[PDB]
């Protein structure tokens, strides 16, 4: 014979704190529980008695209840936290549920962090050099990597691999590997990978000089 109201929608980016409120007249008088529900799945209890966490629920989930408002807080929100959340109250009489909040975890542009790795001395002993360029935690997927050796554009001697969208932050990562003979590697000085991506205002180059600190 009373109603609970939650916002229909909350959106956050990965790592941000999500706050989901449950409101009804004199709600702090009672005990509130929180359920997570994924599409086509059954609800799962994430909090009870305002703020107690069941076994196996990650510690980033916490809660509070006072006055007319109870709050589910997710610290360091992860992509996998995208779901519907329901509050449920108990006054001893009737089991009542909030209308639910859809939590959306938004994945928008992220420029790659770029790293370049010379071949190890160990590998060089075997007569081959692998030079690796890493583009880490970027979005969206589209990215161009070009290799230059002593400013000469390389073609045909590199291969790329890409990860699936990360379960925590929904980004991609990509490795590009340049393969040269030891002889060729030793013939040149400057090794560079040039990266073009929507998140960067212009193409970014990471480079090293062979045989340096």
């Amino acid at each position: 014979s009373y109603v609970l109201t939650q916002p229909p929608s909350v959106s956050v980016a990965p790592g941000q704190t999500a706050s989901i409120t449950c409101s009804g007249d004199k709600l702090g008088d009672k005990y509130v529980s929180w359920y997570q529900q994924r599409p086509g799945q059954s609800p799962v209890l994430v909090l009870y008695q305002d703020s107690k966490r069941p076994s196996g629920i990650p510690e980033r989930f916490s809660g509070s209840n006072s006055g007319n408002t109870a709050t589910l807080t997710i610290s360091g929100t992860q992509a996998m936290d995208e779901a519907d959340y329901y509050c449920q109250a108990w006054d001893s009489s009737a089991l009542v549920f909030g209308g639910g909040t859809k939590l959306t975890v938004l994945r928008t542009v992220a420029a790659p962090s770029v790293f370049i790795f010379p071949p190890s001395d160990e590998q060089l002993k075997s007569g081959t050099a692998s030079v690796v360029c890493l583009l880490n935690n970027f979005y969206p997927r589209e990215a161009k990597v070009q290799w230059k050796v002593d400013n000469a554009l390389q073609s045909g001697n590199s291969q790329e691999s890409v990860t699936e969208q990360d379960s925590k932050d929904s980004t991609y990562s990509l490795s590009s590997t340049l393969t040269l003979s030891k002889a060729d590697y030793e013939k040149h000085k400057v090794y560079a990978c040039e990266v073009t991506h929507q998140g960067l205002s212009s193409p970014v180059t990471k480079s090293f000089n062979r045989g340096e600190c």
């Binding site: 009672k30 005990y31 529980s33 359920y35 059954s42 609800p43 799962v44 209890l45 009870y48 008695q49 069941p54 329901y86 449920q88 109250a89 108990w90 001893s92 009737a94 089991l95 009542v96 549920f97 909030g98 209308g99 639910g100």
Partner: protein, 210 residues
Amino acid sequence: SGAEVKKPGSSVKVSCEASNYVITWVRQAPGQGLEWMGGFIPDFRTAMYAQGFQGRVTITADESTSLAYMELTNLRSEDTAVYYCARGPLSRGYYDYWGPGTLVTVSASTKGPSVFPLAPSSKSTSGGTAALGCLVKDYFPEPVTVSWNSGALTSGVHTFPAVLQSSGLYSLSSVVTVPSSSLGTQTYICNVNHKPSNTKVDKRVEPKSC
């Protein structure tokens, strides 16, 4: 579980596994929130009923199978929802386990079958083989299931795939071949089930009288 279709005015039964815990039935209309329907307390064998359901919620248990059941009767279109069993500890007001959901869609197009005999020919081969069957006509949606003699008769049974008629309703036949010599002493009964319409029909198939 998964998904059931039901006719308006029929009923759906939701079962749950049944110390110091309560069983609760909860439903969720498509795109909507959660609504409590009732519950059962196994240790005290008492039921709880939500007022919004009038007297349409029947709650029963079976001590032996440790199952408890919620039957919702007099179904209407607005009862279309996912139906869940949940469990939690007594007097705490939370549910730490939720069973798998069953989508129940209440659809006016639902129609139960008519069952007609395919009677064995009086010109069947003496000391040869006779055929008989049941024609299950004009139902929607699929499926119907057919057994013979409660499932005790399986040898020589063929139950055909359903066909969609020009009417938009389904039909199928189930047949069996048996010894001609058996026709005068053996009984053959087809058991037809169409869950959407809660139809359960036994038809005895006999040689046509002359």
